[PDB]
Every structure is written in structure tokens, then in C-alpha cells.
Design a protein around this ligand. Sequence first.
Ligand SMILES: Nc1ncnc2c1ncn2[C@@H]1O[C@H](COP(=O)(O)OP(=O)(O)O)[C@@H](O)[C@H]1O
Ligand SMILES: Nc1ncnc2c1ncn2[C@@H]1O[C@H](COP(=O)(O)OP(=O)(O)O)[C@@H](O)[C@H]1O
Ligand SMILES: NCCC[C@H](N)C(=O)O
Ligand SMILES: NCCC[C@H](N)C(=O)O
Ligand SMILES: [Cl-]
Ligand SMILES: [Cl-]
Ligand SMILES: [Cl-]
Ligand SMILES: [Cl-]
Ligand SMILES: [Cl-]
Ligand SMILES: [Cl-]
Ligand SMILES: [K+]
Ligand SMILES: [K+]
Ligand SMILES: [K+]
Ligand SMILES: [K+]
Ligand SMILES: [Mn+2]
Ligand SMILES: [Mn+2]
Lengths: 342, 342
Amino acid sequence: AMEIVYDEADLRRYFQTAVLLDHFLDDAVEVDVDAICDGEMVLIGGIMEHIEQAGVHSGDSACSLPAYTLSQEIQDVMRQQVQKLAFELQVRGLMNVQFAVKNNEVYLIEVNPRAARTVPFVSKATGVPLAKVAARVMAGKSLAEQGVTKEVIPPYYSVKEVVLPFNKFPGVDPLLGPEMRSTGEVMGVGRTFAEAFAKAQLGSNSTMKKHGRALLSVREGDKERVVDLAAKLLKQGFELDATHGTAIVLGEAGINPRLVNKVHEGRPHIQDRIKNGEYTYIINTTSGRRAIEDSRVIRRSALQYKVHYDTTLNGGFATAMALNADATEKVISVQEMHAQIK
Amino acid sequence: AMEIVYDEADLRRYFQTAVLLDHFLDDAVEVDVDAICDGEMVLIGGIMEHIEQAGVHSGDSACSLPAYTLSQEIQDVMRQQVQKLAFELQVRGLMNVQFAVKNNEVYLIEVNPRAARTVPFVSKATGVPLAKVAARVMAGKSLAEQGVTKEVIPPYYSVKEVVLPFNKFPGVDPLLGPEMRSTGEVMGVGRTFAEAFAKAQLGSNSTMKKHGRALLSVREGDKERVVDLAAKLLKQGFELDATHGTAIVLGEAGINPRLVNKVHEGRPHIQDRIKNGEYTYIINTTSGRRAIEDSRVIRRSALQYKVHYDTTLNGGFATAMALNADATEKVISVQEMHAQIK
Ligand SMILES: Nc1ncnc2c1ncn2[C@@H]1O[C@H](COP(=O)(O)OP(=O)(O)O)[C@@H](O)[C@H]1O
Ligand SMILES: Nc1ncnc2c1ncn2[C@@H]1O[C@H](COP(=O)(O)OP(=O)(O)O)[C@@H](O)[C@H]1O
Ligand SMILES: NCCC[C@H](N)C(=O)O
Ligand SMILES: NCCC[C@H](N)C(=O)O
Ligand SMILES: [Cl-]
Ligand SMILES: [Cl-]
Ligand SMILES: [Cl-]
Ligand SMILES: [Cl-]
Ligand SMILES: [Cl-]
Ligand SMILES: [Cl-]
Ligand SMILES: [K+]
Ligand SMILES: [K+]
Ligand SMILES: [K+]
Ligand SMILES: [K+]
Ligand SMILES: [Mn+2]
Ligand SMILES: [Mn+2]
């Protein structure tokens, strides 16, 4: 059990119901790196960039290989960083390192000196059977001896998306957090990140549509960025709805959504609309044990009514991007994929 | 002093701060009628339809001669009612009667057996010097004897608008009510009601513009009709702004105004927007002691910053209409006006 606390008040509050204390890196990109070390050298297996920010368990985040927003310069550091750790730790076989990029700064989140649940994905995107190689390494067959020394950079985009069990347990708030709840994953392969994401999304059993009405209800820290997402949705032909606070923000930017009522506000309220199959998309971000408990109804309703909803703005942008793509336009086989690797 | 209470809880409330008790005829048209009685006949001097509904002092309402919404059917009833009263009370010279029209029903508000303040306006509008006629009657000369027996209905519209002294007392909430506060009045002469109104409004020192951003903030009972007003402003080239409840109603109408924060809501709020010159027009209607007190800021700011504002929906519609006119287009003299009368 983990939780994020925001203020002194919040602290106590936890303490009641409720030990390491760690500063939470707000508005940070989460990254996964799987690598192999034989003592001599380090082979970077894969650099995965999470769609959802740090604070949403790696295990529940979608991720891209290669990174789709991060700088080469920045990867390069993580890369250097891993190597440093691999030797220091005296890693012999697989390892996994988790970072967080904040303001062009790399923070270390944790190191797993073992095989991580990402390996099969990486193995598949890159064509390198990371598990076998690392096994060989463990048995006494260097990377050099194996002929696997260069880091592989795929020609295409591989996106990993998760599948959550919320629908089996309705009483639960289908919301993301620092604790992993997903049961499985899918993979999307595309020429563009948008394509890959689009395939991954569909694969995960998404009910996202390419038209209709979107509901925008984001948190403070998101009010600023939501503008561009709304514009993307609008460009896509979506019609918009927004809860007061968010409507305020959009409007000041030149975007007037239809104002919708919260539950305690009037009628109809979002629930009604959700229930009536009024929306095809919901973007809902929150921040705070209270704000969360208060918005629970949006999420439960959406899940219950099969409306695709995102609980992260990052996730929403990705959803938006994927709108430009067509998951059924092109298929490729694993063999072909790997045949493409130089 | 007069007040309008809305519920039992309101009654006590008043009672505390605080007797005739009169049912208040909501959503009613107020009308003024000026006439002369010589004991033999009754001469109708003028039937004036107010713009502001009953509840807004006749002395502070703009009015039209002739009526601009009242059925002939209904005016005739009032004419008959004025004759009945003239004779009964034994009027000898001028009189004035105030009615309220609710649901095609004529209600009597009051009778003033003397010369009323509308007398000069009616004389100007009609070319008949009612004070001179009534004076001769008082002195012995009948209406028949003077050759003034038929009611005059002029070929043009005459609109009277008032000027309020609120600008001299900034602490005062510049809102209309059952008690008179105006100091003066002007008259507008037009081929249409919109033209007369335009001239009257301009004559009243109104800062109304034919373009810009308007702010809508209306009460419950007006939410229905506000849509049509919002559209009308739309047709004109105005951009809209609105507070929560209003925005809600407009949204349901397909009109998406730019949301605006009530003062307790956040920012920016109306005050800021008004203070920063955002608006060129304001329509703000309120009902209830409490609601009024709360909205005080809007009105006080609108006045301080010189934005044209209406405190009645009837007023806003009139304003709406006038936009279709040009008060400088044509001018006519009283001599000319009077020669047009048959
Ligand atoms: N300091 C931190 N700031 C922001 N997010 C963090 C921080 N520490 C952990 N997280 C988030 O919590 C998740 C779980 O943290 P982690 O230490 O890796 O736990 P686990 O052992 O369950 O894998 C991460 O994948 C990340 O999204
Ligand atoms: N019962 C009522 N329903 C609606 N409006 C009314 C009612 N009684 C009076 N009014 C409003 O109050 C105003 C003033 O009332 P009135 O009886 O004419 O007093 P005054 O002596 O000031 O002329 C009217 O012009 C009208 O707007
Ligand atoms: N990557 C986890 C799934 C994301 C889900 N649509 C959500 O935004 O909550
Ligand atoms: N005839 C009354 C003046 C109108 C003013 N603009 C108001 O509506 O309050
Ligand atoms: Cl359950
Ligand atoms: Cl679709
Ligand atoms: Cl926030
Ligand atoms: Cl004052
Ligand atoms: Cl203008
Ligand atoms: Cl009301
Ligand atoms: K994450
Ligand atoms: K761990
Ligand atoms: K009136
Ligand atoms: K009176
Ligand atoms: Mn972890
Ligand atoms: Mn009166």
C-alpha cells in the first residue's frame, strides 16, 4: 500500500486510516529501462517511455518503444546512468531501472536487478530475446561471446497498453494510481506513435469513437494544458462539454464548450448524460483524496456505460493523437518487423 | 417605501427590518392611461405601454405611445374601464389610471384623479395640450364645446425613457423597483418602435454600442426567454459571456456562451471583466432580496465603468430592437410631427 499526500492536513488524514516518505515528482515522465550486464559491458535492452506520468504505476501505464517525447540527450543520461548502476550493483543478467524526468532532470525511482515484466514487450519490439541472452550470460556466456552488443533501435513504434479488471469489481473506483491493478497487456505496432497507440488502444478493448461528444473535467494543474487537447478534439469534429472550472479555462482561451452540471449542481448532471449515452469520450483528471472521492461517480458511470475515459491528460493526448490513425489500415507480422531491423 | 416579498420566510424577514398586502402580479405589463372627464364624456389622452413590467415604478419605466405589444382588444377594455371610473369617481378635468395586464386580464393598480407626470409627454406625442384642455374643462368649458372629443392616435411612435441619479450615489445599488428614483425623462420619435426607442435610449445618455461583448446573468423566471435574447445579440455580432446558470440554459439551447465567474467563484470574475472593459452590454436580472444583494456588484460595476446595462428582460429586448435602428438617421420637428396627425 502506497498513497500520495499533498499537504500537512492531508498527511495526518492519511495517518489516521493508515514508513518511507518520498517527495512526489509532480508532472514527471516515467521511464523504464531493461538492460543486461555481464560485468564487462552493458547492453541497453530497451528504453520505454510511459504515456501516463509518474504516480501511475509502471505496471498500469501504457508505454512506447522508442520514447515518443523524450530527448536523445535525456535518454543518453538514463543510458549512462544504468550502466553506472549495472556495474555498481554487480549485475549479472537482467536488470530494470525506473526513472522520472522532471524539468530536463533525471531522477532515479528504483532498480530491479532482475527480470522485469517489460522484457517480453521489449523482446518483441526489438527482436532480441532478452531473456535467453541474459540466461546465457548468467550461465557464463558473455554478451560479446553472444554477439549481442549493440543497442537495438526499431524502425517502427511499439506501444504497450494495459487491461484493467475494474469491470469484474464494480464497487471499485476505476482510477489509476501508484499501485498496480492491471491483469494484462497488449501491443500496438505502427509507423508513427499515433498508429501504434491506436492499435494498442483498440487491442485493449477500448470503446473510444472517432466522433461525438467529449466530456472535459480536469484538475487545476491540468487546466492549462487541457486547452490544446480540447482543440485537438474539436479539430476532430467532437462537440464539447465541460464542468464549470474547466469551462472557465477553455473559454478564456477562445473555446466555449457546453457547460454541464456536476452531480450536486443540478440537472441534468454528468451522470445523467453519461447514462443516456451522451458522450463518446471522457477526459477526467483529479488530484486529492477528496477530489477523488468526489469524482468517483464520473469514472464509475463511464466504465459502467462503456464510454472510453482517460484519467490522465497524457493519456488523453495520446488518445487524441491516435484519432489521426487507422488501426485497420495496416498489418505486419512479427517476422516482417524483425526483418526490418538493421 | 414598498417591498416585494416572495415566500413566508421572506415575509418574516421583511417584517423584522420593517400595512397593505397585495398580490404582486408577476410577468405583467404595466400601462398608464391619461384621460379627461367633463361629466358628459371621457376623452382618452393617451394609452402608454411600459417597457419594464409592473413592479418597476411607472415613473422609472420607459414607455411607448402607442402601445407596442398590447392587443387592441385589451386596450379597449382598459379604455372602457377608464370611462367607467371617470364617471363613477366624478372626475372633472384630468385623470390617470394604471393597470396591469396578466394573462389577457386587466388588473387595476391605481387611480390618480389629477394631472399625472405623463401628461406633458402625451401632449407632445399627440399634439393635444391636455393640461390646457383639462383646465378649460375645470373652468366650465366642455370637451364638446372645445372640439376635443376624439382620441388621438399618432402616425409615429413616441417613446419615453428616463434618467436615474444613481451616478450621484455610488453606494446605491442601481437597480429598478417599485419605488421611483428617476429625475428626468426624454422622448424618442420614430417610424417604428425600434427607432423611437433608439432615439429615447440615446437621448437618455446611454453608452450602448452596436458591437462588442455582452454579459448575460438572469434569474430563473427569465432563463427561458433569455435564449431568444442571447440569439438576437448573436445575430447582431455580439459575443456572449454568462454566469453558470445562464450558461447552462443557453447551452441546452445550443448557445454556448463564454463562461464567466461569479465573484465567489474564482477568476476572472465579472467584476474584473467589467473593470477591464470587456463588455459593451450587460443584461442582469434578479429576483429576491438575497439574490439582489448578492448581484449588487454587477450593477454597481456596470455603472461605474459606464457599460450599458438593463435590469429587465423586457428592457433588454427593447435594447435588442433598437440596435436595428439608427437614432441619427432622421430628425423631425414637433411642428412636422403635429402636422402629420389627421
Ligand atoms: N518519488 C516518486 N515520484 C513520483 N512517482 C513515484 C515516485 N516513487 C514511485 N512513484 C510511482 O509509483 C510507482 C511505484 O513505485 P515503485 O517504487 O517502483 O514501486 P513497486 O515496487 O511496486 O514497483 C512507479 O511506477 C511510479 O509511477
Ligand atoms: N399588485 C401589484 N402588482 C404588480 N406591480 C404592482 C402592484 N402594485 C403596484 N405595482 C408596482 O408598483 C408601482 C407603484 O405603485 P403605486 O400604487 O402606483 O404607487 P405610487 O403612489 O407610487 O404611484 C407601480 O407603478 C407598479 O410598477
Ligand atoms: N494505461 C491505463 C489505462 C488508461 C485508462 N483509460 C485511464 O485513463 O484511466
Ligand atoms: N427605464 C429604466 C432605465 C433602464 C436601465 N437601463 C435598467 O434597466 O436598469
Ligand atoms: Cl464489486
Ligand atoms: Cl468510431
Ligand atoms: Cl492539480
Ligand atoms: Cl453614495
Ligand atoms: Cl457602437
Ligand atoms: Cl425569478
Ligand atoms: K507512469
Ligand atoms: K519493485
Ligand atoms: K413598469
Ligand atoms: K400615486
Ligand atoms: Mn517499480
Ligand atoms: Mn402609481
